[PDB]
Amino acid sequence: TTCCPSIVARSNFNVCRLPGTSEAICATYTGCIIIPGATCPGDYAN
């Protein structure tokens, strides 16, 4: 599951994913994170 720190970061993550880029590369590029669970924390609410 991906969790993003702001709405900007989420929007940038979604563009990064359009060509098929790995989630892990899009995470370091945007500041979003990948967790094994389904419950994003409050500081990664977007």
Residue numbers in the entry: 1 to 46
Question: Can I see the authors' text?
Answer:
Crambin belongs to a family of small proteins called thio­nins found only in higher plants and was reported to be membrane associated. Six cysteines are paired into three di­sulfide bridges, and together with five proline residues endow the protein fold with extraordinary structural stability.
As part of an ongoing effort to describe a macromolecule at true atomic resolution, we report here the structure of crambin at 0.70 Å, which is the highest-resolution protein structure determined at RT to date, with data and model quality approaching those of small-molecule crystals. The structure was determined with synchrotron radiation using 31 keV (0.40 Å) X-rays and refined with independent spherical-atom approximation to an R factor of 0.0591 using SHELXL, resulting in the best refined macromolecular structure at RT to date. The structure shows only minimal radiation damage as indicated by analysis of the electron density near the three di­sulfide bridges present in the structure. While there is crystal-to-crystal variation in the relative amount of the two different isoforms, the structure presented here, determined from a single crystal, refines to approximately 64.2 (16)% SI form and 35.8 (8)% PL form. In the final model, 14 residues of the total 46 were modeled with more than one conformation, with conformational variability primarily involving side-chain rotamers. One residue, Gly37, has two main chain conformations. The ordered part of solvent consists of water molecules (see detailed discussion below), and only two molecules (one partial) of ethanol (sufficiently ordered to allow modeling). The number of water sites modeled in this RT structure is 73 (i.e. 75.5% of this expected number). Dynamic solvent networks resulting from alternative side-chain conformations and shifts in water positions are revealed, demonstrating that polypeptide flexibility and formation of clathrate-type structures at hydro­phobic surfaces are the key features endowing crambin crystals with extraordinary diffraction power.
